Amino acid sequence: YTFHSTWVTSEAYSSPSIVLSARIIFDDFREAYYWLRHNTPEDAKVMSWWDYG
Amino acid sequence: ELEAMSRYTSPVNPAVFPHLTVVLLAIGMFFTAWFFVYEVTSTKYTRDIYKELLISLVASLFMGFGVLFLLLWVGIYV
Amino acid sequence: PPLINEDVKRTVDLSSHLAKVTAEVVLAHLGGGSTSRATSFLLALEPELEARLAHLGVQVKGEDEEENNLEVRESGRFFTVKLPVALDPGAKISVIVETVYTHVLHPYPTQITQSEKQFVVFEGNHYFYSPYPTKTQTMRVKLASRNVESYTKLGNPTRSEDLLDYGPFRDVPAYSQDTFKVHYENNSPFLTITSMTRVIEVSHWGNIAVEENVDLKHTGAVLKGPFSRYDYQRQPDSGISSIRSFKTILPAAAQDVYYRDEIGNVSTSHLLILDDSVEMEIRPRFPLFGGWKTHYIVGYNLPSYEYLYNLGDQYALKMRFVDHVFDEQVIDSLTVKIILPEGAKNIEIDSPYEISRAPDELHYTYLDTFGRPVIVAYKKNLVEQHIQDIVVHYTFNKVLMLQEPLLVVAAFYILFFTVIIY
Amino acid sequence: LRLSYEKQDTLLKLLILSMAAVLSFSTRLFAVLRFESVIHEFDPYFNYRTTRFLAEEGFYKFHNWFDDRAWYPLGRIIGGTIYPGLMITSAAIYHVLHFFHITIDIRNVCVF
Ligand SMILES: *[C@@H]1O[C@H](CO)[C@@H](O[C@@H]2O[C@H](CO)[C@@H](O[C@@H]3O[C@H](CO[C@H]4O[C@H](CO[C@H]5O[C@H](CO)[C@@H](O)[C@H](O)[C@@H]5O)[C@@H](O)[C@H](O[C@H]5O[C@H](CO)[C@@H](O)[C@H](O)[C@@H]5O)[C@@H]4O)[C@@H](O)[C@H](O[C@H]4O[C@H](CO)[C@@H](O)[C@H](O)[C@@H]4O[C@H]4O[C@H](CO)[C@@H](O)[C@H](O)[C@@H]4O)[C@@H]3O)[C@H](O)[C@H]2NC(C)=O)[C@H](O)[C@H]1NC(C)=O
Ligand SMILES: CCCCCCCCCCCCCC(=O)O[C@H](COC(=O)CCCCCCCCCC[C@@H](C)CCCCCCCCCCCC(=O)O[C@H](COC(=O)CCCCCCCCCC)COP(=O)(O)OCC[N+](C)(C)C)COP(=O)(O)OCC[N+](C)(C)C
Ligand SMILES: CCCCCCCCCCCCCC(=O)O[C@H](COC(=O)CCCCCCCCCC)COP(=O)(O)OCC[N+](C)(C)C
Ligand SMILES: CCCCCCCCCCCCCC(=O)O[C@H](COC(=O)CCCCCCCCCC)COP(=O)(O)OCC[N+](C)(C)C
Ligand SMILES: [Mg+2]
């Protein structure tokens, strides 16, 4: 049971949702958010789906 | 001036920081455990204040030094 | 004592987002006597570019260095130089004068489409603006590309492939002011660090860790219209004036570089350990096109022995005031903070150049009872030639650092005592 | 040497519980060991922002707080629209860790 729990924790449950794991990682989400932060007027309003709220 | 000043080498060779961190912690932890065991087993009529003070002081000293060397080992360099 | 400039060759280069002019002055003294030994040299600056100045250095024929101090006369912030050997009447001395002007190339269209090139304009002077009447002046202008559009003509300036020569002017007035303006193509990386904060924390236990926050903005030729990743990738022409990466040079003892942003780590960098330094190519999260103001954080820790000298009870450390960021940099605001340890009693700081300085304050990191002193120095308009070494001297009782372990101890002890009373 | 039954029993219980707690804390941090430590799954970013507010503005300003940066056409009152226990716990741990100078950013406290 100990070994099973360790394997399930290691290989399935630990994962990021901000970065797509492919070892090469492409963090397009963060780059887009940073651009939107630094290169829009201070009152710009962006609309998306409720997931990315 | 600046020519007659020696380079400031650390007082403890950094390669000795890991070896010193484990030992100082282990001993410390050991004593700590002892103290707590002593406080659960011993009744009111079988408690010596000097023994408790001695063991607690030893544990505190060793634990403080071990915690410092670990905190410095991770790289905080306090 | 009247001074005559004989030959003045002025080579200006405008390839960078900068204007560097090097004048090879040759000074002679007049035949009149009762002048003895002249020992002072006077330098002037035109009122157009007196505020956009970053550095003015003066050398001598061969390998040498000299000292200039700012002076006021009763106005263009005239400088004066102290010559090593005073020149008698009838002697001649060669003095090389190198100045650097920042924020002087203005983009003329001011709005460029994702598939166009930058056209900048420069407005300087024809003649050597000096308080002495010169004799033979020749100016050579170095450009970025061979796409000039309008250069003022005075003496039929011939044109080579990318360098423009101006006919030698036989004689000039006392103050020889004139307006010279070029409109050329400069598709080079324009980049301005708006505010860089350098924090240097010293620790007598191990090493010293320096971290710097960098706000940087692409100034010239702001972007109009839509940006398209497709055209940017599948067409190498489009995107000329943009920037993609820049390399920092680290002092060859850096050990823990991280390059974090304000929102998380950044996985786009490449560091190579060289024999004399540590090169680090950096890509921002996104390419810069016009006014895109990226902001990042770069920090590292190096061995203490390399930058810390201790004799008796005194310690003295010398480090670079402003460190390399990218080739031909420019800063608009720079704040140095040096975080000394707790027992820094007599703190003196030797500045290589005049640095504006604010009052000292206290910093409270982990094992601090009464805090630790920090030294803050504010400077503006820094260029690549402002990379010098600042040394601070302070006395520090060696026993005192022992208060950092003991502190921890006491806390532990308190807990045990609490148990006892319970 | 010989020990009493009570002493060996207490030592065994203490050792087992210490090992179990250390293992529980150790097993939790796999993601932190791999990728850099950042709040994830974009559900807790709201909690994270809220915790930062509580850590840099106070409680009385947090209890009655109106957020104009979300649901722009309407109004969202964060002070009374969510159960505040997690933010209070994090802010209390943060202030305790800051009284004794163990200064740690709000993000590291939220992560761990
Ligand atoms: C948190 O953030 C930090 C910081 O951002 C993250 O850290 C970063 O992680 C990346 C990993 O992607 C590290 O990258 C590495 O960079 C080094 C250095 O490479 C530079 O120098 C090379 C030297 O080239 C010499 O030789 C050539 C001729 O061959 C000459 O022409 C040169 O002049 C030099 O003399 C150079 O070749 C590199 O070029 C690359 O970049 C340019 C752009 O400038 C491109 O055009 C090129 O095509 C080329 O891509 C570069 O200039 C590299 O050496 C590392 O490569 C290793 O890993 C590669 C795969 O990732 C692999 O393909 C390489 O072969 C190399 O492999 C090495 O290691 C393997 C095992 O790992 C071995 O199997 C293998 O044999 C070999 O030994 C890598 O690219 C950053 O350095 C690092 N940054 C910092 C500050 O540490 C961190 O990851 C983040 N945390 C996360 C995400 O969790
Ligand atoms: C297994 C052996 C371990 C040996 C330990 C050695 C220490 C080594 C240190 C770790 C090394 C780390 C290596 C490292 O750092 O690598 C770096 C990378 O850096 C990192 O990122 C890693 C950083 C990780 C650092 C983490 C360090 C944290 C260490 C904490 C330590 C541990 C081990 C133990 C924690 C103890 C937890 C306490 C548990 C509480 C128990 C609850 C008690 C339950 C209870 O109530 O029982 C009752 C009885 O009552 C009691 O009496 C109990 C009171 C106990 C209270 C406390 C006692 C604990 C003592 C334990 C010994 C039972 O109730 P009952 O009696 O039954 O009730 C009945 C009552 N009546 C009704 C009366 C009968 C290397 O990276 P590098 O690359 O080198 O970076 C360096 C680079 N540079 C920066 C240098 C440049
Ligand atoms: C950044 C780093 C910060 C470091 C934080 C330091 C943490 C300090 C830990 C404090 C330890 C608590 C002390 C404690 O547990 O008290 C125990 C009572 O023991 C119990 O009954 C169970 C309590 C166990 C709780 C331990 C959780 C502590 C976790 C803190 C992080 C005393 O019980 P006793 O008094 O011994 O009961 C025996 C009574 N007889 C009459 C039978 C003798
Ligand atoms: C009860 C009252 C007291 C409450 C006490 C609360 C205890 C909080 C425990 C969390 C400790 C946080 C440690 C931590 O932040 O480590 C992380 C990531 O770095 C790591 O690798 C750490 C992972 C495992 C370390 C876990 C040690 C925690 C031990 C606590 C007992 C660092 O993240 P970064 O932000 O990346 O730091 C790097 C920045 N530099 C510039 C320095 C490089
Ligand atoms: Mg110290």
The CA R_g of chain A, rounded to the nearest whole Å, is 17
Give me the residue from D34, D38, D72 closest to A18, CB to CB. Answer: D38
In DSSP terms, which residues pair with C363 in a beta bridge? C372
Which among C152, C148, C178, C180 has a CA at the least distance from the CA of C163? Answer: C148
In whole angstroms, what separates CA C82 from the centre of its chain?
24
Task: Answer yes or no: are the C-beta atoms of A35 and C285 closer than 8 Å.
Answer: yes
* CB count in 10 Å sphere of residue D35: 19
Binding-site residues of D for Mn(2+): 43
CB within 8 Å: D4 and B33: no
- Helix B17-41 to helix D5-28 angle (10° resolution) is 130
Gap from CA of B19 to ligand 5 centroid (Å): 21
Instruction: Give me the residue label for tokens 């002019």.
Output: C21
C234-247: buried (b, 16+ CB within 10 Å) or exposed (e) per residue?
eeeeebebbbeebb
- Ligand 1 closest atom vs CA C280: 86
Rounded distance, CA C258 to CA C248, Å? 13
What pairing do the DSSP bridges indicate for beta strands C180-185 and C150-151? Answer: antiparallel
CB C147 within 8 A of CB C35: no
C267: closest CA among C282, C252, C248, C289?
C282
Tell me which H or E stretch contains C7. Answer: strand C7-13
Contact A39 C293 (CB under 8 A): yes
The packing angle between helices B49-74 and B17-41, to 10°, is 150
* Cα–Cα distance for residue pair B66/B68, rounded to 1 Å: 5
Give D18 Cα–ligand 2 centroid separation in angstroms: 7
Could you say which of D36, D38, D101 has the minimum Cβ distance to residue C366? D101
Q: Phi-psi bin for C397: left (phi > 0), alpha (psi -120 to 50), beta?
A: beta
H/E element holding B26?
helix B17-41
- Distance, in Å, from the CA atom of C1 to the CA atom of C26, rounded to the nearest integer, reads 16
Q: Does ligand 4 have an atom closer than 6 angstroms to the CB of D21? A: no
Token pair, residue D83, equals 């159960």
What does the block give as tokens for C376?
């803050």
Please give the structure tokens belonging to residue C251.
């002092």
Question: How far apart are the CA of C403 and the nearest CA of chain B, in angstroms?
Answer: 11
D70 burial via Cβ count (<10 Å: 0-12, 13-18, 19+):
exposed
CA proximity to C81, closest of C118, C35, C47, C132: C132
Q: Would you call D40 and A51 a contact, using CB atoms and an 8 Å cutoff?
A: no
Is the shortest distance between the CB of C265 and ligand 1 below 6 Å?
A: yes
Query: Between A9, A21, A25, which is nearest D30 by CB?
Result: A9
Nearest residue on chain D to C408, alpha-carbon basis: D100
How many domains does the structure of chain B reveal? 1
Spell out the residues 6+ positions from residue D48 whose beta carbon is closer than 8 angstroms to its own: D39, D107, D110
Q: State the closest ligand 1 atom to the C-alpha of A19, by its place in the atom list counted from 1.
A: 93
DSSP tag of C115: T
- Least CB–CB distance from B60: residue in C207, C391, C416: C416
Show which residues on chain C lie within 8 Å of chain B, measured between beta carbons.
Answer: 203-207, 209, 256, 301, 304-306, 308-311, 314-316, 318, 365-367, 391, 404-413, 416-417, 419-420
Residue C390 and residue C352 in contact, taking contact as beta carbons nearer than 8 Å: yes
User: C179 C-alpha vs ligand 1 centroid, how far in Å?
Assistant: 50
Contact C229, C286 (CB under 8 A): no
CA distances from C331 to B15, C58, C93, C286, C289 (A): 40, 22, 35, 21, 19
> For tokens 């402003």, what's the residue?
C322
Cβ–Cβ contact B48 with C under 8 A: no
Q: Report CA(C289)–ligand 4 centroid distance (Å).
A: 38
Ligand 3 first shell, C-beta below 6 A: B 39-40; C 415, 419, 422; D 102
Helix (H, G, I), strand (E, B) or coil at B54: helix
Please report, for chain C, the start and end positions of each structural domain, with discontinuous segments joined by +. 1-186, 187-396, 397-422
Does C have 3 or more CB contacts under 8 Å with B? yes
∠ Cα B19 C342 C377 (to 5°):
120
Neighbours of ion ligand 5 (CB under 5 A): C 341, 401
Q: How far apart are CA C374 and CA A26, in angstroms?
A: 40
Closest-CA residue, ligand 1 atom 5, reads: C267
C-alpha gyration radius of chain B: 19
| Nearest residue of C to residue D100, measured between CA atoms | C366
Q: What DSSP string describes C144-177?
A: SSS---EE--SS---B-SSEEE-PPBS---SS--
Is D35 an 8 Å CB contact of chain A? yes
What would you measure as the largest C-alpha separation in chain A, in angstroms? 55
| Pocket lining: C269 vs ligand 1, CB cutoff 6 Å | yes
Please name the residue of chain C whose CA is at the shortest distance from the CA of residue D101. Answer: C366
Method used for this model? Answer: cryo-EM
> Where in C261-386 does DSSP place strands (E)?
269-273, 278-282, 294-302, 308-311, 314-320, 330-331, 334-339, 348-350, 356-357, 361-363, 372-379, 382-383
Per the DSSP assignment, residues forming a β-bridge with B6 are C310
Bridge partners of C67?
C82
Q: Which domain holds residue B30?
A: 1-78
Which DSSP helix (H) or strand (E) runs through D33? helix D31-34
Count of C-beta atoms within a 10 Å radius of residue C293: 13
Q: Are strands C372-379 and C361-363 parallel, antiparallel or unpaired?
A: antiparallel
CA torsion angle A41 A42 A48 A51 (round to 10) = 140
Output the furthest CA–CA distance in chain C (Å, rounded).
Answer: 100
